[PDB]
Target: Mu-theraphotoxin-Cg1a
Amino acid sequence: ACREWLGGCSKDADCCAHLACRKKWPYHCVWDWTV
Model:
């Protein structure tokens, strides 16, 4: 289980993939190349 882009991230291991748990709000995983 993981969250995709723009979804509440419980993990900072890019939740799903190619992502990153946005730590600067909104905390919901953003694209790794935009974080």
Q: What stands out?
A: The beta strands are 19-20, 30-31. The chain has one domain: 1-35.
